[PDB]
Amino acid sequence: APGQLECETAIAALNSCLRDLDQASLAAVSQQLAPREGISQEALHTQMLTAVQEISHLIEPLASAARAEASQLGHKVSQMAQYFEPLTLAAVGAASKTLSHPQQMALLDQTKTLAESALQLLYTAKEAGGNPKQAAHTQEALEEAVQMMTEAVEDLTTTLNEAASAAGVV
């Protein structure tokens, strides 16, 4: 079951991050997301930027490992998943400390979108397995998943800058 158990666990953990994000949004949409104390907006945005950058740097290597190297795939998905727990925590804290409700929702929604795209990457990468004899339907699906994650990273990143600027975070 080579690299496949790592996929299962990775996928379960992203599913879990996404429920935390839906709770935050639900709380947020009804103006009951209490601002998180103990931590600065700077450090949260720093947490968020970092995790996003590392997820981004991990997309192609993950994709490439899925086209060939089963062993390596298992390590790259767990890598990609570890980054999502801290991102999700950071994103919920940051959003909670954002004043403009639309901007608070945009952070949550775009973080959700990125997790969703990660999820799809993981499904298509797990189907590919190591096995290079995967179909071209698997090939086309994986490349799409990659392209979807890349655009998600683009969107969240921009939204990160905007929120940063509103909060004077440097």
Binding site: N15, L18, R19, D22, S25, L26, V29, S30, D109, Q110, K112, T113, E116, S117, L119, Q120, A145, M148, M149, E151, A152, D155
Partner: protein
């Protein structure tokens, strides 16, 4: 009897006024039976070109869609069928669709994996909740009420939690979350 006319008028009106949303193709098939009812058996020389005023035969969203041709095929296909039974096949056809007697709300979904909202018909019955395509009226997904564990409306959204039936809440943007929730809350209370 005479009920069959009351029923016909009701099914028919619901489709014409959009309360019962249907696909273009079905709209036309319905129009075909409505022609048989209002005009008798089809005749290629009378039932011609601009003979129909489409605004009385199709839902508003389909009038500008150029449907006369296929309304006329569905009309032809009736033959020497009678009003009485033409009326019954309409009522049967309506009853035959998964959209029949569903309360529908036009909401917006965020596409999975993308920052993009799509319009969506969300339907609530006795038995299920269903996602339906705004254009094709395809039932793209259904959930039994029995798999819905929790829900919450806000002034801007509605959200379902199916628990351990699937991963991820389903959530839509709508100004009608309260109504949607009351509908569902009612039906689930009733299942006890």
């Amino acid at each position: 009897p005479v009920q069959l006319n009351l029923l016909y008028v009701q099914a028919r009106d619901d489709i014409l006024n959009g309360s019962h949303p249907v696909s273009f193709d079905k709209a036309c098939e319905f129009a075909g039976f409505q022609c048989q009812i209002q005009f008798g058996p089809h005749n290629e020389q009378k039932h011609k070109a601009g003979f129909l005023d489409l605004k009385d035969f199709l839902p508003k969203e389909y009038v500008k869609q150029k449907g006369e041709r296929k309304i006329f095929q569905a009309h032809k296909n009736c033959g020497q069928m009678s009003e009485i039974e033409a009326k019954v096949r309409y009522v049967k056809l309506a009853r035959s669709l998964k959209t029949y007697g569903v309360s529908f709300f036009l909401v917006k979904e965020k596409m999975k994996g993308k920052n993009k909202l799509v319009p969506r018909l969300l339907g609530i019955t006795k038995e299920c909740v269903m996602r339906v395509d705004e254009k094709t009226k395809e039932v793209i997904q259904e959930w039994s009420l029995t798999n819905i564990k929790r829900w919450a409306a806000s002034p801007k959204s509605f959200t379902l939690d199916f628990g351990d039936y699937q991963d991820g809440y389903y959530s839509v943007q709508t100004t009608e979350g309260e109504q949607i929730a009351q509908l569902i809350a009612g039906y689930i209370d009733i299942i006890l």
